[PDB]
Amino acid sequence: IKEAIQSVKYIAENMKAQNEAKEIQDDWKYVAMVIDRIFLWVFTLVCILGTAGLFLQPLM
Amino acid sequence: PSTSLVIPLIGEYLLFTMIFVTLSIVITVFVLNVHYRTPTTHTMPSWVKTVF
Amino acid sequence: VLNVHHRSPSTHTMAPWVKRCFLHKLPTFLFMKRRQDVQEALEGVSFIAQHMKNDDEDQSVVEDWKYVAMVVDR
Amino acid sequence: VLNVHHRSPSTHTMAPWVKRCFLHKLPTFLFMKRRQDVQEALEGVSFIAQHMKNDDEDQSVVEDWKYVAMVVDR
Amino acid sequence: RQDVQEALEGVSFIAQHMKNDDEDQSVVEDWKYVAMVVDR
């Protein structure tokens, strides 16, 4: 009788813990996306600077 | 030819691009290790919460 | 077009122009066509219902991103 | 080291020697550190709770296999 | 009373759905073990 209500409490607590773990995994994915974007911009600038300063400018 | 006096601009550009693409794979293995990571195996630090 | 396939609500947010453009005009243009112990129990069941409704909303948004990627692909 | 990552609890049994070796000593050596209609409704809810408990246990064991793979990898 | 009757049918449907889901999961794990035996 009381066991069913305690089981519903257990299900609710399990789903809350699973939600918090999914939040932590989303944070780990978002920090990887941030590192990906900053190195995208850095290597885009380095590639454009290299193809400008080393390939066209002396060879003209 | 194999003349060691001066190097061509195209071979220098190829070496440049090979160095940076190798650095790109050593960055992408790090971001793949950062991505697949769970709280049941690793604890997330405090200084990474503010900076990254 | 593969990057806009894996977008989730926990990272990105769908802008209103890509709401109104890639779902109404172009899919019709490209031929797509779509007592005290009892009190806590109600709180737990309401939390379960809220969690499942939020899960269905996130699944609807990720299906929306998949359909947008399909339209841009075509 | 990729075979031990995909070992499920339903098809394999975790031996006690990998318990005592690859979980306690080596994660410290390598700096890892981790009424007949009414009565069946209660029995159904009890069955749902016991199945979620069993599912949590098997998920813990498969994450334990993943951690063993990570230790062997490092 | 009329509102109470459909909830018990809902709980019974959830129980039957999870039991069929567990049987299907057991059969697909059986197929995985058959693949493992043939591979060895």
UniProtKB/Swiss-Prot annotation, chain A:
Superkingdom field = Eukaryota
The subcellular localization recorded is: Synaptic cell membrane; Cell membrane; Endoplasmic reticulum; Golgi apparatus
State which residue ranges cross the membrane.
35-53
Q: Which residues form a coiled coil?
A: none
Q: How is it modified after translation?
A: Ubiquitinated; by STUB1/CHIP and thereafter degraded by the 26S proteosome complex.
Q: What does the protein in this record do?
A: Component of neuronal acetylcholine receptors (nAChRs) that function as pentameric, ligand-gated cation channels with high calcium permeability among other activities. nAChRs are excitatory neurotrasnmitter receptors formed by a collection of nAChR subunits known to mediate synaptic transmission in the nervous system and the neuromuscular junction. Each nAchR subunit confers differential attributes to channel properties, including activation, deactivation and desensitization kinetics, pH sensitivity, cation permeability, and binding to allosteric modulators.
What is the disorder linked to it? Bladder dysfunction, autonomic, with impaired pupillary reflex and secondary CAKUT: An autosomal recessive disease characterized by impaired innervation and autonomic dysfunction of the urinary bladder, hydronephrosis, vesicoureteral reflux, small kidneys, recurrent urinary tract infections, and progressive renal insufficiency. Additional autonomic features are impaired pupillary reflex and orthostatic hypotension. The disease manifests in utero or early childhood.
Q: Which family does it belong to?
A: Belongs to the ligand-gated ion channel (TC 1.A.9) family. Acetylcholine receptor (TC 1.A.9.1) subfamily. Alpha-3/CHRNA3 sub-subfamily.
Protein name from the UniProt record: Neuronal acetylcholine receptor subunit alpha-3
Coding gene?
Answer: CHRNA3
Parent-protein start and end of this portion? 441 to 500 of 505
Swiss-Prot record, chain B:
Q: Which top-level group of life is the source organism from?
A: Eukaryota
Q: Post-translation: what modifications?
A: Ubiquitinated; by STUB1/CHIP and thereafter degraded by the 26S proteosome complex.
Q: Which residues form a coiled coil?
A: none
TM segments? 14-32
Q: Where in the cell is it found?
A: Synaptic cell membrane; Cell membrane; Endoplasmic reticulum; Golgi apparatus
Give the disease association: Bladder dysfunction, autonomic, with impaired pupillary reflex and secondary CAKUT: An autosomal recessive disease characterized by impaired innervation and autonomic dysfunction of the urinary bladder, hydronephrosis, vesicoureteral reflux, small kidneys, recurrent urinary tract infections, and progressive renal insufficiency. Additional autonomic features are impaired pupillary reflex and orthostatic hypotension. The disease manifests in utero or early childhood.
What is known about its subunit structure?
Answer: Neuronal AChR is composed of two different types of subunits: alpha and beta. CHRNA3/Alpha-3 subunit can be combined to CHRNA5/alpha-5, CHRNB2/beta-2 CHRNB3/beta-3 or CHRNB4/beta-4 to give rise to functional receptors. Forms stoichiometries such as (CHRNA3)2:(CHRNB4)3 or (CHRNA3:CHRNB4)2:CHRNB3. Part of a complex composed of STUB1/CHIP, VCP/p97, CHRNA3, and UBXN2A that modulates the ubiquitination and endoplasmic reticulum-associated degradation (ERAD) of CHRNA3.
Family assignment? Belongs to the ligand-gated ion channel (TC 1.A.9) family. Acetylcholine receptor (TC 1.A.9.1) subfamily. Alpha-3/CHRNA3 sub-subfamily.
State what protein this is by name: Neuronal acetylcholine receptor subunit alpha-3
Q: Which organism is it from?
A: Homo sapiens (Human)
Q: Gene of origin?
A: CHRNA3
Curated annotation (Swiss-Prot), chains C, D:
Where in or outside the cell it occurs: the entry states: Synaptic cell membrane; Cell membrane
Its subunit composition reads: Neuronal AChR is composed of two different types of subunits: alpha and beta. CHRNB4/Beta-4 subunit can be combined to CHRNA2/alpha-2, CHRNA3/alpha-3 or CHRNA4/alpha-4, CHRNA5/alpha-5 and CHRNB3/beta-3 to give rise to functional receptors. Forms stoichiometries such as (CHRNA3)2:(CHRNB4)3 or (CHRNA3:CHRNB4)2:CHRNB3. Interacts with RIC3; which is required for proper folding and assembly. Interacts with LYPD6.
Q: What does this protein do?
A: Component of neuronal acetylcholine receptors (nAChRs) that function as pentameric, ligand-gated cation channels with high calcium permeability among other activities. nAChRs are excitatory neurotrasnmitter receptors formed by a collection of nAChR subunits known to mediate synaptic transmission in the nervous system and the neuromuscular junction. Each nAchR subunit confers differential attributes to channel properties, including activation, deactivation and desensitization kinetics, pH sensitivity, cation permeability, and binding to allosteric modulators.
Family to which this protein belongs: Belongs to the ligand-gated ion channel (TC 1.A.9) family. Acetylcholine receptor (TC 1.A.9.1) subfamily. Beta-4/CHRNB4 sub-subfamily.
The name this protein goes by in its record: Neuronal acetylcholine receptor subunit beta-4
Origin species: Homo sapiens
Organism ancestry: Eukaryota, Metazoa, Chordata, Craniata, Vertebrata
Give the shown range, full length included: 316 to 460 of 498
